[PDB]
């Protein structure tokens, strides 16, 4: 649902999902042959399945190809400074 749908929220207001109380197989998404960018900071995907966390949040928004770069910690840019900024201690995964 958070990966394939008719329309998602735009970068001006990205939506949060609060995915929890369920199991996940991150390697299924890892092995997919359509996702290009997988800048997933913090816990490695190979141990992401085994590692248990309090919650796994979700995001979805539309940004330019050259402005995908602006969703990383310690970053400046048009989207990064104005629409969406990431904490310097970020932990999670990013897919584009």
């Amino acid at each position, epitope marked *: 649902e958070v990966f394939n749908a008719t329309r998602f929220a735009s970068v001006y207001a990205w939506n949060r999902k609060r995915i929890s109380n369920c199991v996940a197989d991150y390697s299924v998404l890892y092995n997919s042959a359509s996702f290009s960018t*997988f800048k997933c*900071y913090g816990v*490695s995907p190979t141990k992401l399945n085994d590692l248990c966390f309090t919650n796994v949040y979700a995001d979805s928004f539309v940004i330019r190809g050259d402005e*995908v770069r602006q969703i990383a910690p310690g970053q400046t840019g048009k989207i990064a400074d104005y629409n969406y900024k990431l904490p310097d201690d970020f932990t999670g995964c990013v897919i584009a």
Partner: antibody
Amino acid sequence: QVQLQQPGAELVLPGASVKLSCKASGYTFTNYWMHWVKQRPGHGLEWIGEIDPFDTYIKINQKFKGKSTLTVDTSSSTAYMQLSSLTSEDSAVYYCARPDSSGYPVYFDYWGQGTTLTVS
Amino acid sequence: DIVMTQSHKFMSTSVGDRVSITCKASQDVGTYIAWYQQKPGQSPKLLIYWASTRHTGVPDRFTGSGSGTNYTLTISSVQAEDLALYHCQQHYSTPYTFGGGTKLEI
């Protein structure tokens, strides 16, 4: 403080294999992938491949396919290479590069010492 | 894959001079270039972890710019410790490539 020590001073006659170690300390061996870079003065640095800890996920750079091998042991936080049939064109220095995160793409923020490969 | 071929074979600038380090990219990868400081006899040390950002422990002299295809790093002043090698890498895809390096001298 982050410690990434290297044994260094690796010399083997051509046609044989040598063992390289990369002991990591000062951070998490679980949450940090291991990436390798070889320093050649002729044309600068180059990427070897990527290995995940406590598993056998293999991704080898198209430049050093075949000879390059990836081996990681959870105990002692040591990652290994045993490159068989080293030639006289392989005389250079090996560095194991720690990345900022364990998710590609990365930029290998912290590099340790270098293990020199030399043919005698 | 994307291959790094820097355009500055050597850089000859004095102390405090304003000059840029230009490295090209094989194709338009947007902005995914990184920089390292490799002193002679020293492992390459991260200087600007991204195209135009600033990592921890960075001298204020280093500041890069990303035009999309021709990435440059402009340095207002050059000190003794800056005498090292400059490397560019593409963190866009899995197969990584490194630049040839540039030696700085007075």
